[PDB]
Amino acid sequence: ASAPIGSAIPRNNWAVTCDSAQSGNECNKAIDGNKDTFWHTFYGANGDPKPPHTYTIDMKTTQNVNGLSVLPRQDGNQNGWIGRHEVYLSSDGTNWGSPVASGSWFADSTTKYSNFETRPARYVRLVAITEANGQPWTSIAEINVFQASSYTAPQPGLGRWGPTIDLPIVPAAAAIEPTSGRVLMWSSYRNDAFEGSPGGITLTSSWDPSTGIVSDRTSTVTKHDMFCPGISMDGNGQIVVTGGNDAKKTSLYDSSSDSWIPGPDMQVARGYQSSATMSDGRVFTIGGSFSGGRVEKNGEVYSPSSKTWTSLPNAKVNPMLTADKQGLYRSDNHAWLFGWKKGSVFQAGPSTAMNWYYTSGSGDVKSAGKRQSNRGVAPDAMCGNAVMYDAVKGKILTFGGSPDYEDSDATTNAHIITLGEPGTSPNTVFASNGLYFARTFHTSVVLPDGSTFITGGQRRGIPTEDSTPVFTPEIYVPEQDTFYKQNPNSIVRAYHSISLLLPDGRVFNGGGGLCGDCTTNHFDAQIFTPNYLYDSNGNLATRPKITRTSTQSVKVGGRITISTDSSISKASLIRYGTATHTVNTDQRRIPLTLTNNGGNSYSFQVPSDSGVALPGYWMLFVMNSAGVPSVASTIRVTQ
Numbered sequence: 082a083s084a085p086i087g088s089a090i091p092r093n094n095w096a097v098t099c100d101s102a103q104s105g106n107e108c109n110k111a112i113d114g115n116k117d118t119f120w121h122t123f124y125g126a127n128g129d130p131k132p133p134h135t136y137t138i139d140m141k142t143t144q145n146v147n148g149l150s151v152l153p154r155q156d157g158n159q160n161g162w163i164g165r166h167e168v169y170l171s172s173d174g175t176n177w178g179s180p181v182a183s184g185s186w187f188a189d190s191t192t193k194y195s196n197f198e199t200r201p202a203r204y205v206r207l208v209a210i211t212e213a214n215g216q217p218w219t220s221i222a223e224i225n226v227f228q229a230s231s232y233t234a235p236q237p238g239l240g241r242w243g244p245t246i247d248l249p250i251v252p253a254a255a256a257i258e259p260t261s262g263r264v265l266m267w268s269s270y271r272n273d274a275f276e277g278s279p280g281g282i283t284l285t286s287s288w289d290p291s292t293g294i295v296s297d298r299t300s301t302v303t304k305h306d307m308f309c310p311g312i313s314m315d316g317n318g319q320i321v322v323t324g325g326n327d328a329k330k331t332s333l334y335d336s337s338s339d340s341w342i343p344g345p346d347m348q349v350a351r352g353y354q355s356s357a358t359m360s361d362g363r364v365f366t367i368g369g370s371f372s373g374g375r376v377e378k379n380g381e382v383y384s385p386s387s388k389t390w391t392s393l394p395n396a397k398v399n400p401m402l403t404a405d406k407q408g409l410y411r412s413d414n415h416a417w418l419f420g421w422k423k424g425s426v427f428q429a430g431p432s433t434a435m436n437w438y439y440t441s442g443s444g445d446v447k448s449a450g451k452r453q454s455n456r457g458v459a460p461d462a463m464c465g466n467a468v469m470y471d472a473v474k475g476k477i478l479t480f481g482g483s484p485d486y487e488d489s490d491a492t493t494n495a496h497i498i499t500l501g502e503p504g505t506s507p508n509t510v511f512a513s514n515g516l517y518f519a520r521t522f523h524t525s526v527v528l529p530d531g532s533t534f535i536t537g538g539q540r541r542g543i544p545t546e547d548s549t550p551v552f553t554p555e556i557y558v559p560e561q562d563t564f565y566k567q568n569p570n571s572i573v574r575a576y577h578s579i580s581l582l583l584p585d586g587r588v589f590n591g592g593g594g595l596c597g598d599c600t601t602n603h604f605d606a607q608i609f610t611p612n613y614l615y616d617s618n619g620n621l622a623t624r625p626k627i628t629r630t631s632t633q634s635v636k637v638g639g640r641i642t643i644s645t646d647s648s649i650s651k652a653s654l655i656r657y658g659t660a661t662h663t664v665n666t667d668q669r670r671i672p673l674t675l676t677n678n679g680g681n682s683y684s685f686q687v688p689s690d691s692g693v694a695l696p697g698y699w700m701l702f703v704m705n706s707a708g709v710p711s712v713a714s715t716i717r718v719t720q
C-alpha cells in the first residue's frame with residue numbers, strides 16, 4: 082500500500098467540474114464518499130472522446146495542499162484507470178502555472194497518490210493525459226485532496242523542492258542512461274514487493290526529463306530479479322548489475338541500444354554487495370551476504386572484453402567486516418568502494434578498518450588504517466555514504482550511517498579521507514563539526530561545483546518504517562569545510578531510497594519502502610533544484626551553453642576543446658551515477674583546469690591516470706562567473 086503525507090480535506094462544500102460525464106456517472110460521484118459510485122467520461126451513446134480528461138475542484142477556500150489520492154472504480158472493470166497524469170494548483174482558478182506533480186500510475190485498481198510539497202491553493206486540477214491501457218475514458222470512484230498542518234515558504238538561497246514525479250514502481254535502484262539522458266529505475270519482480278519472488282524477472286521504469294514521460298516495462302531476457310544488487314558502469318559503457326534476488330546472475334544494461342543483455346554468472350552468489358569499476362574498466366566486487374548464503378565471500382573481477390568473472394580468493398573480505406549485531410548477513414554489505422590507481426580498489430568503510438584491495442594475480446588486501454580523527458576512532462557506519470568529490474586530489478567525504486544495519490542510532494560523524502598511492506594509509510580528518518542531522522539510509526550526490534548534496538534517511542534505522550525521518554538536506558562545501566542546511570522536503574526517503582545527479586544539474590531523489598503490504602511504499606521521486614540555478618530574485622538564472630565539443634569520446638590523458646556562448650570561469654567532469662541501498666560507486670568528480678583560447682573557446686586535459694579518470698561516461702559542466710552551470714555535455718572516457 083501507500084499513503085498520503087497530509088490529512089483529507091472535508092469535501093462538503095466543494096464544487097467540481099469535469100470535461101465530460103456519463104449520466105449516472107456524474108462528476109460529483111467522485112466526492113460522494115461511496116466506493117461503489119464513480120465519475121466516468123462520455124462513452125457509448127455520447128461517443129468515446131479520448132484523453133486528456135480533466136477533473137477540477139473548487140474547494141471554496143485556500144488550503145495548504147500537499148497531495149491528492151485517486152481510488153479507481155471498484156467493480157472489477159478496468160476502464161478509465163489513469164495512466165499518465167498531471168496535477169495543478171491555483172489560487173484563482175485561471176492561472177494554473179506548471180504541474181506540482183506528474184508522471185504515471187501503475188495499471189491496477191489500487192488507490193493512487195500524488196504527494197508533493199505544500200502549496201496554498203483553492204483550486205486543484207487533475208489531468209488524465211492517458212488511460213492506463215490506452216483506452217479513451219477516465220473514471221474515478223473517490224478523489225481526495227490532502228493538507229499539511231501548516232505552510233512555511235521556502236527560504237531564499239537554500240534551493241527548492243519540486244515537482245514530484247509519480248511512478249508505477251518504488252524506484253529502489255536507479256541509474257542515468259548516459260546516451261539518452263533518461264533515468265532508469267527498477268524495483269523487483271513486481272512494482273512494490275521483493276518477498277515471494279519467482280526469480281527471473283524485474284519490473285523497470287524510466288523517466289525522460291525532457292518530455293516528462295514516465296513508462297514501465299518488464300525485463301526477463303537476463304532471467305534476473307535485480308532487487309538488492311551490486312551496480313557498476315564498466316569501461317565498455319555498460320551497467321553491470323549483479324546478484325540480489327537471483328544471487329548468481331549478471332545483467333548488462335546497454336544505454337546506446339536501450340536494452341538488457343545477459344552476462345556471465347558470478348563465481349560466488351551475492352546480495353547487497355558493492356561493486357566498483359576499476360582503472361582498466363573491469364568490475365570488482367566483494368562481500369554481499371543478503372542472498373546466496375551467509376559464508377565468507379572474497380573478491381572477484383568481471384572482464385567486459387572476455388565476458389568472464391574470475392575469483393580473487395586472496396582479496397579477503399574478512400578485514401572489512403563490520404561488527405554488526407546480525408552477523409555475517411549484514412557485516413559484509415554495502416562496502417564504500419572506489420576504483421583507484423593500478424587496478425586497486427579502496428574500501429573506505431562502513432567498517433572502522435579501511436583497506437586497499439588489489440586485483441593482480443589471485444588478489445590481495447592491505448590494511449589502510451582506521452577511519453578516525455582527533456575526535457577518536459570512528460565506529461562502524463553501516464549505510465553511511467561515501468562520495469569522491471575531488472578525484473584528482475583523492476578526496477572522499479564520508480558521513481552518517483549506524484553501527485548496526487537495523488535498530489541502531491545513526492551518527493553525525495563525517496570524515497575527509499585523502500587518498501595517495503595504493504598501499505599507503507590515507508590521512509583522515511573530521512569534516513567541519515559533522516552533520517546537522519544524524520541519519521542512516523540517506524543518499525548523496527556530488528554536484529558540479531564540488532559540493533556534496535545529502536538528503537533523507539532516518540535518525541534510527543528501521544527498514545519498512547518511516548519513523549524518525551530527516552526532512553532537511555545538507556550541502557557540504559569543501560572550500561569552506563562547512564555544512565549548510567537546505568530547504569526541507571515533505572516526503573520520507575529512508576530505506577530503499579536513491580538519489581542521482583541529473584544531466585541538467587538538478588538532483589533526482591526517490592523511492593523508499595518496497596515492503597509489499599506496508600503503507601510506506603513511495604511510488605515517486607522529487608526534484609531538488611540547488612541554489613546555483615537561481616538568481617538573487619529567486620528566478621531561474623540564465624545558463625551558459627556548450628555550443629560545440631571537439632570530441633565526444635576521449636582517452637585518459639587526452640585533450641578536449643569546447644566553444645561556449647558566454648564566458649566561463651570553472652568546469653568539472655562528473656562520472657555518471659548508479660544508486661541502490663545508499664551505494665553509488667560510480668559517481669566522482671574531476672575539477673578541470675581550463676585554458677582560454679580566446680573567442681569563448683576553452684580546452685582541458687582529461688587526467689592521464691585512469692584510476693582517477695575511471696573509464697565510462699562522464700558529464701561535462703561549465704560554470705559562468707555567477708556560478709551557474711550549463712546542462713551537461715556527455716563525454717565517454719576510454720583507456
Ligand SMILES: [Cu+2]
Nearest residue numbers: 253309577662
Ligand atoms: Cu533492500
